[PDB]
A = this chain, B = another copy of it.
Amino acid sequence: GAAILPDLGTEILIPVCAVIGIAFALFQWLLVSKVKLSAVDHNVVVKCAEIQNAISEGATSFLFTEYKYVGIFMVAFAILIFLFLGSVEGFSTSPQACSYDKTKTCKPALATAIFSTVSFLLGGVTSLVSGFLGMKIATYANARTTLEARKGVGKAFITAFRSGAVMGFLLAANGLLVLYIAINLFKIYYGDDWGGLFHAITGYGLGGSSMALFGRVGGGIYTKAADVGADLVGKVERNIPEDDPRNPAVIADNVGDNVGDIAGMGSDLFGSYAESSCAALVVASISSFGLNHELTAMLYPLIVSSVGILVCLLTTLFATDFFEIKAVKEIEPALKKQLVISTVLMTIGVAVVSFVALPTSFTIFNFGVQKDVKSWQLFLCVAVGLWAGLIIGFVTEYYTSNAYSPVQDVADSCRTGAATNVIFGLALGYKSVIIPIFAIAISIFVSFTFAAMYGIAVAALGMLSTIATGLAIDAYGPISDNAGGIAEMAGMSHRIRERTDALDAAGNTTAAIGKGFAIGSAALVSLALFGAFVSRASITTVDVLTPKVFIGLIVGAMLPYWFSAMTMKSVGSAALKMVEEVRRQFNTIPGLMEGTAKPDYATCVKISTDASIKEMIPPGALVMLTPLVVGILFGVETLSGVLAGSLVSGVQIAISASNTGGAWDNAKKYIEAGASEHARSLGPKGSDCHKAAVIGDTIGDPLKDTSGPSLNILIKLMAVESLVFAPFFATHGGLLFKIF
């Protein structure tokens, strides 16, 4: 029948939790504000503050530029959405039989065409705010982390983690709240037509991820162009420290961290959150929950997320208060414990939520038939995703942390030069896919078996139920990155850089981990969305052994490579420019190498601004146009193949790129830190071994920061896009087969 938790209870619980998540984030921002500094040893607090201003000014500046374009694109694309969805019923205004129940009347397809546009814009905008907010907190916390490092690793860790949590909590609560608001607003018009309500609502994730795609690639190109240029000429050529203020590309590099690893990453994960929620909602909308108009159960995913916010708050308190770091070897397990604790607490949280928000029996729509599902089967659906996530974290840590043998061997291979470094690095990344894929496959199998597409979507959301914490441990990294950047630029003592280098190395692992969650959840949500698309397209069977499906499958499997070709080439080209620029300034500015002359930072900022803004367009277009072109020309069966193929194929390359990139970075950190006999025998900085690592790191740069992480967006974006345009491809698509 109904659940223990009455509807009005749900309607209160959700926004209350969002409000708690927001209040908690503000509180943390407030605590961080205790670290004082101003640009008006005293000299060192003044240099930190000016550098921080430079970075802040650059990051805010680029985003406004980027968002202007993306914002325009968004508005264009929303028009396409209205037009195409609107034409499905020739823009009629009349009601129609509910496609999920012929006996009832549903709102016109036109309404949905309109509201899908509204949720799209909503998601687009929210995705922009997610990246902008993360950027504001990161550019605020970076120099404060630097100053706090004067007292030790532990203190700096706290200010970087707290701030990472500012972003995590803000993003989760705001994404939750907006969606919650959107649903309640849409419902006023839809009333009893919940299928229409929730089918319109899915624009929200389409919005989120479209904007994310450009945010990730734009930011991604911007940052790696600087990073490669700065590192190659500075470290490999001119034998100076990494973020040396003599290096004209350092400002661009550090801004790059906020603009890619933060803003782009933030948008990326918002889209993950939005899509997973949306995919669970559409399926439930025509399951027993939606048909019987049972609000609490319908909003199950949002209740899961609300509780995630609370669990993550708790988990946060452990790292922030109940515990203290005194030694560097403690940083990574601190971070790892955030995942362990949250996963355990959330397992209990989901149990409770599954107990009180689900009737013990219900039906889940399953390709035209109401499948009987029990609430303990559902618990296992979200729990299996949540646990697959954790497994993925552990495996990814094992492959990217310099505490373990894979990366150490990679560093060790530097002893025979760059070529062996790269071979080992590539080999490592390839190897690293094995277990996450099994974890994903297991997740699919359990969740698919128990509750079809709905179960799979709820597994995705389970993997993202602790998104607040996931984001915190991840956002922690770029802030720690800037901290050391600012330390070197501020001429602070070697003790500070060693501390930031410890934080930053842990950040590399944490980043690989976040990528892992992004890929894992993306594979889940995409499968669910694929299934939903299939019903909506009135496809009876996706048969791999039909010519239309199979050509789609193989072409779909190529797109991730097409996409990587473009993004790699962009970074490669922009970095080539950057290096020529950096060399020139060392070669022609008297006193630069000497330390008496100040370099031109703006020119480097300009090179990575010009390249990113321009070169984000073709890959964005590839992804976004593909479902349209394929659906219109070849049709829904073929598009089917493309969805499956880009899923199973993209996922392998996404994982191996992000991990290979991470492994190289930390293999270099291992050499730079020389905190063991092995490490030292590879040093010191400047050695042939070290420069070999730098070469690896630098090749890994676009792998793990531009193409790699955007691949998960490629996959999940094409999937909501397809679901949103499904009736339009069903009705007006497959032209090439119609004319012939």
Q: Which residues of A contact B (CB under 8 A)?
A: 228, 232, 236-237, 367, 413, 415-420, 422-424, 426-434, 437-438, 440-441, 444-445, 448-449, 523, 527, 530-531, 534, 541-545, 547, 549-551, 553-558, 560-562, 564-566, 568-569, 571-572, 575-576, 579-580, 640, 644-645, 647-649, 651-653, 656, 694-695, 698-699, 702
Choice from B420, B544, B565 contacting A544 with Cβ under 8 Å: B544
* A440 CA / B448 CA spacing, docked (Å): 32
Choice from B367, B428, B555 contacting A441 with Cβ under 8 Å: B555
Assess whether B424 is in contact with A572, with CB atoms less than 8 Å apart.
yes
Assess whether A419 is in contact with B699, with CB atoms less than 8 Å apart.
yes
Choice from B558, B569, B651 contacting A652 with Cβ under 8 Å: B558
**A433 CB contacts on chain B under 8 angstroms:** 558, 561-562, 565
**How many whole Å from A735's CB to the nearest CB in chain B?**
16
Summarize A's interface: helix, strand, loop or mixed: helix
Of A438, A534, A545, A571, most buried by chain B (CB within 10 Å of CB) is A545
Query: Given A431-B569, A649-B557 in contact, is the A420-B576 Cβ separation under 8 Å?
Result: yes
Q: 25 A-B pairs, CB-CB below 8 angstroms?
A: A232-B420, A237-B417, A367-B545, A418-B419, A418-B695, A420-B575, A422-B422, A422-B695, A423-B568, A423-B575, A423-B702, A424-B569, A424-B572, A426-B699, A427-B568, A427-B572, A431-B569, A437-B554, A437-B558, A440-B554, A534-B545, A554-B647, A648-B648, A649-B652, A652-B653
Query: Given A418-B418, A433-B561, A530-B545 in contact, is the A553-B648 Cβ separation under 8 Å?
Result: yes
Quick one: closest B residue to A415, CB to CB?
Answer: B576
**How many whole Å from A579's CB to the nearest CB in chain B?**
4
Copies of the polypeptide in the assembly: 2
Query: Given A541-B541, A545-B542 in contact, is the A562-B444 Cβ separation under 8 Å?
Result: no
Query: Given A431-B569, A530-B545, A543-B543 in contact, is the A441-B551 Cβ separation under 8 Å?
Result: yes
**How many whole Å from A703's CB to the nearest CB in chain B?**
8
Choice from B429, B431, B544, B698 contacting A419 with Cβ under 8 Å: B698
Query: Given A554-B440, A572-B413 in contact, is the A562-B430 Cβ separation under 8 Å?
Result: yes
Quick one: closest B residue to A543, CB to CB?
Answer: B541
Of A237, A572, A699, most buried by chain B (CB within 10 Å of CB) is A572
Choice from B420, B580, B651 contacting A557 with Cβ under 8 Å: B651
Query: Given A232-B417, A422-B699, A568-B423 in contact, is the A547-B445 Cβ separation under 8 Å?
Result: yes
* A232 CA / B421 CA spacing, docked (Å): 13
* A694 CA / B422 CA spacing, docked (Å): 13
Quick one: closest B residue to A646, CB to CB?
Answer: B648
Quick one: closest B residue to A556, CB to CB?
Answer: B648
Quick one: closest B residue to A443, CB to CB?
Answer: B551
Assess whether B416 is in contact with A565, with CB atoms less than 8 Å apart.
no
Assess whether B417 is in contact with A695, with CB atoms less than 8 Å apart.
yes
**A449 CB contacts on chain B under 8 angstroms:** 547
**How many whole Å from A552's CB to the nearest CB in chain B?**
9
Assess whether A430 is in contact with B564, with CB atoms less than 8 Å apart.
yes
**A572 CB contacts on chain B under 8 angstroms:** 413, 420, 423-424, 427
**A228 CB contacts on chain B under 8 angstroms:** 419-420, 423
**A640 CB contacts on chain B under 8 angstroms:** 544
**A647 CB contacts on chain B under 8 angstroms:** 554
Query: Given A420-B572, A651-B557 in contact, is the A431-B550 Cβ separation under 8 Å?
Result: no
* A431 CA / B559 CA spacing, docked (Å): 10
* A423 CA / B417 CA spacing, docked (Å): 17
**How many whole Å from A456's CB to the nearest CB in chain B?**
10
* A3 CA / B171 CA spacing, docked (Å): 72
* A560 CA / B649 CA spacing, docked (Å): 10
Assess whether B530 is in contact with A561, with CB atoms less than 8 Å apart.
no
* A702 CA / B426 CA spacing, docked (Å): 11
**A557 CB contacts on chain B under 8 angstroms:** 557, 648-649, 651-652
Assess whether A416 is in contact with B644, with CB atoms less than 8 Å apart.
no
Assess whether B430 is in contact with A565, with CB atoms less than 8 Å apart.
yes
In addition to A228-B423, A423-B575, A560-B652, 14 A-B residue pairs with Cβ atoms within 8 Å of each other are A416-B580, A418-B695, A426-B568, A427-B568, A427-B572, A432-B565, A441-B551, A530-B545, A543-B543, A544-B544, A544-B640, A544-B644, A554-B647, A554-B651
Assess whether B652 is in contact with A434, with CB atoms less than 8 Å apart.
no
**A702 CB contacts on chain B under 8 angstroms:** 423
Assess whether B579 is in contact with A420, with CB atoms less than 8 Å apart.
yes
**A645 CB contacts on chain B under 8 angstroms:** 648
* A429 CA / B420 CA spacing, docked (Å): 20
Assess whether B547 is in contact with A544, with CB atoms less than 8 Å apart.
no
Quick one: closest B residue to A552, CB to CB?
Answer: B441
**How many whole Å from A390's CB to the nearest CB in chain B?**
20
Assess whether A554 is in contact with B523, with CB atoms less than 8 Å apart.
yes
**How many whole Å from A516's CB to the nearest CB in chain B?**
15
Assess whether B232 is in contact with A430, with CB atoms less than 8 Å apart.
no
Quick one: closest B residue to A652, CB to CB?
Answer: B561
Assess whether B448 is in contact with A576, with CB atoms less than 8 Å apart.
no
Choice from B236, B422, B649 contacting A648 with Cβ under 8 Å: B649
Quick one: closest B residue to A643, CB to CB?
Answer: B544
Assess whether A558 is in contact with B444, with CB atoms less than 8 Å apart.
no
**How many whole Å from A277's CB to the nearest CB in chain B?**
22
**A434 CB contacts on chain B under 8 angstroms:** 558, 561-562, 565
* A644 CA / B417 CA spacing, docked (Å): 39
* A555 CA / B572 CA spacing, docked (Å): 32
Query: Given A555-B437, A561-B433 in contact, is the A575-B544 Cβ separation under 8 Å?
Result: no
**A542 CB contacts on chain B under 8 angstroms:** 543-545
**How many whole Å from A433's CB to the nearest CB in chain B?**
5
Assess whether A561 is in contact with B416, with CB atoms less than 8 Å apart.
no
**How many whole Å from A158's CB to the nearest CB in chain B?**
36
* A210 CA / B413 CA spacing, docked (Å): 33
Assess whether B541 is in contact with A419, with CB atoms less than 8 Å apart.
no
* A57 CA / B433 CA spacing, docked (Å): 41
**A419 CB contacts on chain B under 8 angstroms:** 228, 232, 418, 575, 694-695, 698-699
**How many whole Å from A480's CB to the nearest CB in chain B?**
24
**A575 CB contacts on chain B under 8 angstroms:** 416, 419-420, 423
Quick one: closest B residue to A649, CB to CB?
Answer: B649
Assess whether A576 is in contact with B413, with CB atoms less than 8 Å apart.
yes
**How many whole Å from A138's CB to the nearest CB in chain B?**
27
**A232 CB contacts on chain B under 8 angstroms:** 416-417, 419-420
**A653 CB contacts on chain B under 8 angstroms:** 652
Quick one: closest B residue to A567, CB to CB?
Answer: B427
**How many whole Å from A535's CB to the nearest CB in chain B?**
10
Quick one: closest B residue to A430, CB to CB?
Answer: B565
Query: Given A544-B544, A545-B534 in contact, is the A569-B427 Cβ separation under 8 Å?
Result: yes
Query: Given A445-B551, A555-B437 in contact, is the A565-B652 Cβ separation under 8 Å?
Result: no
Assess whether A554 is in contact with B441, with CB atoms less than 8 Å apart.
yes
